Design a protein around this motif. Structure first.
Motif, PDB file in Angstrom:
ATOM      1  N   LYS A  49       0.850  -1.185   0.000  1.00 38.97           N
ATOM      2  CA  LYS A  49       0.000   0.000   0.000  1.00 38.97           C
ATOM      3  C   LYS A  49       0.881   1.229   0.000  1.00 38.97           C
ATOM      4  CE  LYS A  49      -4.327   1.929   1.623  1.00 38.97           C
ATOM      5  NZ  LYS A  49      -5.431   1.874   2.626  1.00 38.97           N
ATOM      6  N   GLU A  66      -2.744   3.804   9.982  1.00 36.18           N
ATOM      7  CA  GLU A  66      -3.149   2.436   9.642  1.00 36.18           C
ATOM      8  C   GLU A  66      -2.009   1.437   9.904  1.00 36.18           C
ATOM      9  OE1 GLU A  66      -4.005   1.617   5.486  1.00 36.18           O
ATOM     10  OE2 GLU A  66      -4.999  -0.271   6.018  1.00 36.18           O
ATOM     11  N   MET A  70      -1.794  -1.631  12.867  1.00 35.27           N
ATOM     12  CA  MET A  70      -1.462  -3.015  12.495  1.00 35.27           C
ATOM     13  C   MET A  70      -0.333  -3.509  13.378  1.00 35.27           C
ATOM     14  SD  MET A  70      -1.929  -2.884   8.346  1.00 35.27           S
ATOM     15  CE  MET A  70      -1.817  -4.628   8.136  1.00 35.27           C
ATOM     16  N   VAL A  96       2.013  -5.831   3.350  1.00 32.18           N
ATOM     17  CA  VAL A  96       1.153  -6.774   4.041  1.00 32.18           C
ATOM     18  C   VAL A  96       1.080  -8.078   3.259  1.00 32.18           C
ATOM     19  CG1 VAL A  96      -0.226  -4.792   4.930  1.00 32.18           C
ATOM     20  CG2 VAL A  96      -1.067  -6.123   2.964  1.00 32.18           C
ATOM     21  N   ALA A  99      -3.253 -12.008  -0.701  1.00 27.42           N
ATOM     22  CA  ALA A  99      -4.378 -12.944  -0.786  1.00 27.42           C
ATOM     23  C   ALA A  99      -4.683 -13.079  -2.272  1.00 27.42           C
ATOM     24  CB  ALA A  99      -5.575 -12.380  -0.011  1.00 27.42           C
ATOM     25  N   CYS A 152     -10.186  -3.688  19.060  1.00 26.74           N
ATOM     26  CA  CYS A 152     -10.402  -3.140  17.708  1.00 26.74           C
ATOM     27  C   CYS A 152     -11.887  -3.326  17.291  1.00 26.74           C
ATOM     28  CB  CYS A 152      -9.434  -3.808  16.723  1.00 26.74           C
ATOM     29  SG  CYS A 152      -9.655  -3.360  14.970  1.00 26.74           S
ATOM     30  N   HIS A 154     -14.092  -3.024  13.922  1.00 26.40           N
ATOM     31  CA  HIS A 154     -13.908  -2.938  12.481  1.00 26.40           C
ATOM     32  C   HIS A 154     -14.664  -1.771  11.849  1.00 26.40           C
ATOM     33  CE1 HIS A 154     -13.497  -3.788   8.290  1.00 26.40           C
ATOM     34  NE2 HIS A 154     -12.616  -4.764   8.521  1.00 26.40           N
ATOM     35  N   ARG A 155     -16.010  -1.712  12.014  1.00 30.60           N
ATOM     36  CA  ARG A 155     -16.930  -0.688  11.481  1.00 30.60           C
ATOM     37  C   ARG A 155     -17.374  -0.929  10.024  1.00 30.60           C
ATOM     38  NH1 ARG A 155     -13.636   2.163  15.198  1.00 30.60           N
ATOM     39  NH2 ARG A 155     -14.909   3.197  16.800  1.00 30.60           N
ATOM     40  N   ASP A 174      -9.036  -4.185   5.717  1.00 33.38           N
ATOM     41  CA  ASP A 174      -9.849  -2.974   5.805  1.00 33.38           C
ATOM     42  C   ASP A 174      -9.607  -1.996   4.653  1.00 33.38           C
ATOM     43  OD1 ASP A 174     -11.977  -1.343   6.875  1.00 33.38           O
ATOM     44  OD2 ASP A 174     -10.382   0.019   7.554  1.00 33.38           O
ATOM     45  N   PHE A 175     -10.664  -1.776   3.845  1.00 35.09           N
ATOM     46  CA  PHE A 175     -10.773  -0.854   2.706  1.00 35.09           C
ATOM     47  C   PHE A 175     -12.239  -0.733   2.293  1.00 35.09           C
ATOM     48  CE2 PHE A 175      -7.881  -4.407   0.799  1.00 35.09           C
ATOM     49  CZ  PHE A 175      -8.865  -5.369   0.787  1.00 35.09           C
ATOM     50  N   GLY A 176      -7.659  -1.682  10.201  1.00 30.86           N
ATOM     51  CA  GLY A 176      -6.787  -0.633  10.718  1.00 30.86           C
ATOM     52  C   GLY A 176      -7.088   0.773  10.235  1.00 30.86           C
ATOM     53  N   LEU A 177      -8.046   0.932   9.303  1.00 28.63           N
ATOM     54  CA  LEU A 177      -8.438   2.243   8.779  1.00 28.63           C
ATOM     55  C   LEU A 177      -9.102   3.102   9.859  1.00 28.63           C
ATOM     56  CD1 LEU A 177      -9.926   1.353   5.240  1.00 28.63           C
ATOM     57  CD2 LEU A 177      -7.676   2.224   5.693  1.00 28.63           C
TER      58      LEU A 177
HETATM   59  C1  LIG Z   1      -2.133  -3.197   1.038  1.00 29.94           C
HETATM   60  C2  LIG Z   1      -2.992  -3.338   2.245  1.00 29.94           C
HETATM   61  C3  LIG Z   1      -2.846  -2.478   3.323  1.00 29.94           C
HETATM   62  C4  LIG Z   1      -3.621  -2.611   4.459  1.00 29.94           C
HETATM   63  C5  LIG Z   1      -4.568  -3.609   4.545  1.00 29.94           C
HETATM   64  C6  LIG Z   1      -5.441  -3.855   5.737  1.00 29.94           C
HETATM   65  O1  LIG Z   1      -6.190  -4.810   5.746  1.00 29.94           O
HETATM   66  N1  LIG Z   1      -5.337  -2.942   6.775  1.00 29.94           N
HETATM   67  C7  LIG Z   1      -6.115  -2.862   7.933  1.00 29.94           C
HETATM   68  C8  LIG Z   1      -6.388  -1.640   8.502  1.00 29.94           C
HETATM   69  C9  LIG Z   1      -7.163  -1.563   9.644  1.00 29.94           C
HETATM   70  C10 LIG Z   1      -7.698  -2.700  10.230  1.00 29.94           C
HETATM   71  C11 LIG Z   1      -8.569  -2.579  11.471  1.00 29.94           C
HETATM   72  N2  LIG Z   1      -9.327  -1.299  11.599  1.00 29.94           N
HETATM   73  C12 LIG Z   1     -10.523  -1.264  10.713  1.00 29.94           C
HETATM   74  C13 LIG Z   1     -11.184   0.094  10.789  1.00 29.94           C
HETATM   75  N3  LIG Z   1     -11.577   0.410  12.197  1.00 29.94           N
HETATM   76  C14 LIG Z   1     -12.303   1.692  12.305  1.00 29.94           C
HETATM   77  C15 LIG Z   1     -10.400   0.334  13.095  1.00 29.94           C
HETATM   78  C16 LIG Z   1      -9.737  -1.021  12.985  1.00 29.94           C
HETATM   79  C17 LIG Z   1      -7.407  -3.936   9.658  1.00 29.94           C
HETATM   80  C18 LIG Z   1      -7.944  -5.227  10.202  1.00 29.94           C
HETATM   81  F1  LIG Z   1      -7.639  -6.316   9.455  1.00 29.94           F
HETATM   82  F2  LIG Z   1      -7.477  -5.539  11.448  1.00 29.94           F
HETATM   83  F3  LIG Z   1      -9.303  -5.217  10.239  1.00 29.94           F
HETATM   84  C19 LIG Z   1      -6.616  -4.000   8.522  1.00 29.94           C
HETATM   85  C20 LIG Z   1      -4.728  -4.471   3.463  1.00 29.94           C
HETATM   86  C21 LIG Z   1      -3.966  -4.323   2.327  1.00 29.94           C
HETATM   87  C22 LIG Z   1      -4.112  -5.274   1.273  1.00 29.94           C
HETATM   88  C23 LIG Z   1      -4.148  -6.185   0.493  1.00 29.94           C
HETATM   89  C24 LIG Z   1      -4.209  -7.342  -0.320  1.00 29.94           C
HETATM   90  C25 LIG Z   1      -3.627  -8.564  -0.115  1.00 29.94           C
HETATM   91  N4  LIG Z   1      -3.974  -9.424  -1.121  1.00 29.94           N
HETATM   92  C26 LIG Z   1      -4.792  -8.748  -1.918  1.00 29.94           C
HETATM   93  C27 LIG Z   1      -5.476  -9.106  -3.087  1.00 29.94           C
HETATM   94  C28 LIG Z   1      -6.260  -8.191  -3.660  1.00 29.94           C
HETATM   95  C29 LIG Z   1      -6.373  -6.888  -3.089  1.00 29.94           C
HETATM   96  N5  LIG Z   1      -5.762  -6.481  -2.019  1.00 29.94           N
HETATM   97  N6  LIG Z   1      -4.963  -7.453  -1.458  1.00 29.94           N
END
Ligand SMILES: Cc1ccc(C(=O)Nc2ccc(CN3CCN(C)CC3)c(C(F)(F)F)c2)cc1C#Cc1cnc2cccnn12
Length: 292
Positions: A49, A66, A70, A96, A99, A152, A154-155, A174-175, A176-177
């Protein structure tokens, strides 16, 4: 621009070979050389990212936040894990886990049964048993129970925010945000996953994520079905105020529909927790047929 260095996570830039874009900041597929201390000679496919060229200082602060989140949450099999970062001498890269089978909605839809004259050329080379579907639900509940244990919320829990690896492991992403009328890239309205108290009172808790998990269960058992198709925001508000609930999908047990309905309790305190859902899904998986 000038970020401090965290040696726990720093990967030298010359170790990362940027590849094709996966989504749009922006996510690109990459190959990381010697991501682990041993072996320094192995390549790992990763997702990177980064900000787009039109990003502002706020977008940078969001990416940093973000990445920071993580680090705090720690590692779990059913979440997309942080593997590293390039923070020094160039743009910020948040590395990261990759998948390869995309999001759960896409994964499910591609494995729908073959097309018929009333659909007729969808000929999948990939198929899911009833046990596989309950397994997806169990894995997502496990990721969520872990996130909940790390305090955490998610929302935006939905099949689009669940990624699937080459080994078919479910990973919460998340699309940690907020604009209720804003649609996803696929043309769906995220308000359709929101608990009424999150929607009407902006109250976000683990209980409201449990509501979203009930919609996610419905997405699983309809094999990537679209919740409330053709229902605009205003009509959705009216359906929720009336206590309307989605119908039981076909090829869904009474027990799993009872679980969805429990997740959709009007009273947040009465919904099951992710801990209870993991235990019930653990028992259900073991008793569910893989013969069909
Ligand atoms: C580059 C990248 C960066 C970051 C993240 C990511 O998931 N970040 C994340 C941010 C926050 C939170 C938790 N919060 C949610 C909001 N909330 C308000 C606070 C808590 C979580 C969580 F998993 F813990 F939920 C994760 C994923 C990718 C990806 C990718 C990837 C890998 N394979 C593929 C194949 C196709 C497409 N993409 N891809």
């Amino acid at each position: 621009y000038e970020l401090p260095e965290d040696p726990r996570w720093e990967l030298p830039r010359d170790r990362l070979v940027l590849g094709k874009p996966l989504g749009e900041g922006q996510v690109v597929l990459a190959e990381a050389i010697g991501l682990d201390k041993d072996k320094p000679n192995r390549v790992t496919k990763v997702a990177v990212k980064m900000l787009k060229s039109d990003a502002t200082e706020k977008d940078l602060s969001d990416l940093i936040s973000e990445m920071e989140m993580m680090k705090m949450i720690g590692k779990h099999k059913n979440i997309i894990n942080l593997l590293g970062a390039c923070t020094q001498d160039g743009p910020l890269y948040v590395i990261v886990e990759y998948a390869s089978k995309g999001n759960l909605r896409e994964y499910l839809q591609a494995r729908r049964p073959p097309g018929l004259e009333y659909s007729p050329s969808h000929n999948p080379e990939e198929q899911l048993s009833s046990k596989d579907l309950v397994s997806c639900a169990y894995q997502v509940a496990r990721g969520m129970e872990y996130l909940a244990s790390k305090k955490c919320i998610h929302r935006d829990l939905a099949a689009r925010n669940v990624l699937v690896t080459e080994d078919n492991v479910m990973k919460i992403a998340d699309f940690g945000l907020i604009d209720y009328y804003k649609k996803t890239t696929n043309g769906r309205l995220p308000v359709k996953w929101m608990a009424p108290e999150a929607l009407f009172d902006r109250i976000y808790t683990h209980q409201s994520d449990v509501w979203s998990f009930g919609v996610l269960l419905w997405e699983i058992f309809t094999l990537g079905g679209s919740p409330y198709p053709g229902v605009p925001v205003e009509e959705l508000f009216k359906l929720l105020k009336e206590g309307h609930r989605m119908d039981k999908p076909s090829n869904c047990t009474n027990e799993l529909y009872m679980m969805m309905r429990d997740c959709w309790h009007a009273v947040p305190s009465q919904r099951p927790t992710f801990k209870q859902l993991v235990e019930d899904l653990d028992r259900i998986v073991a008793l569910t047929s893989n013969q069909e």
